Amino acid sequence: DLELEPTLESIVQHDSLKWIFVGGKGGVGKTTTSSSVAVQLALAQPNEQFLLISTDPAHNLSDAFCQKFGKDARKVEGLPNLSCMEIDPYKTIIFDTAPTGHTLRFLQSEVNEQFTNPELTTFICVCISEFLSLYETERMIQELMSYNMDVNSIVVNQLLFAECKRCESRWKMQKKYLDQMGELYEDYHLVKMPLLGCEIRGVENLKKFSKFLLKPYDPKADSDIVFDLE
Numbered sequence: 001d002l003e004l005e006p007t008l009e010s011i012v013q014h015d016s017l018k019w020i021f022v023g024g025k026g027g028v029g030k031t032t033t034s035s036s037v038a039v040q041l042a043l044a045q046p047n048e049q050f051l052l053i054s055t056d057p058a059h060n061l062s063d064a065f066c067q068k069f070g071k072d073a074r075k076v077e078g079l080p081n082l083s084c085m086e087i088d089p090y091k092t093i094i095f096d097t098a099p100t101g102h103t104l105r106f107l108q109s110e111v112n113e114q115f116t117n118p119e120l121t122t123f124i125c126v127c128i129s130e131f132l133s134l135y136e137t138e139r140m141i142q143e144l145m146s147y148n149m150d151v152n153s154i155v156v157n158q159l160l161f162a163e164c165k166r167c168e169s170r171w172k173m174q175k176k177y178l179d180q181m182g183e184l185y186e187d188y189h190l191v192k193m194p195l196l197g198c199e200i201r202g203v204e205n206l207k208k209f210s211k212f213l214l215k216p217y218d219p220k221a222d223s224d225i226v227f228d229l230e
Ligand SMILES: Nc1ncnc2c1ncn2[C@@H]1O[C@H](COP(=O)(O)OP(=O)(O)O)[C@@H](O)[C@H]1O
Pocket: 025, 026, 027, 028, 029, 030, 031, 032, 033, 060, 098, 157, 158, 159, 193, 194, 195, 196, 197, 198, 199, 200, 201
């Protein structure tokens, strides 16, 4: 079977991973995706300890989790096996690389043997379906491949789906690039994630978002999620 599952299932069930990097253009949903992945990992294996670290020069994790984080790791309230860390420079470390274009200088020696080992390290690209993000995602992947960092999954986030005149017009754009991505990323897990009815904040909402990272979102059947955030 040549059609890869459009999910992060292969990554979250990849028991040997030590590093899960998350990268992409500013605003595409790296805080959201990296936090949701970390929440899923923590929930699935409650006896193992997970760290979510962000290099974003922002209180991104703090605002997403509604809890104060910093340079020292601190456990997430309600998920005692997940810690978060915000540092402007564990079974698995999930690593939001914001700003990705700069952090890709930092990821540059026994750590390197870890990074270039596909059994220990993967890099999830996040993008939105518009020209700049797509083309910068292509560029980022080419660069990661040249440094032998594994990439097998790409999240396309903030999608509107079939069917509001503005939304119809915007979906016309989105699907044009989505169709292009389908072809570009045939050898990849290409996860289609919908735009929700509000920002994604708090552990409960992050958990809900993470559901469709692991099971393919069907806009005809699953659209309650858009309005299901509290
Ligand atoms: N699928 C989505 N639906 C609704 N809001 C989203 C979605 N993805 C991200 N967001 C929101 O969009 C904003 C940017 O997302 P964020 O994950 O912080 O991007 P990044 O970390 O890539 O800069 C945040 O305020 C976040 O709550």
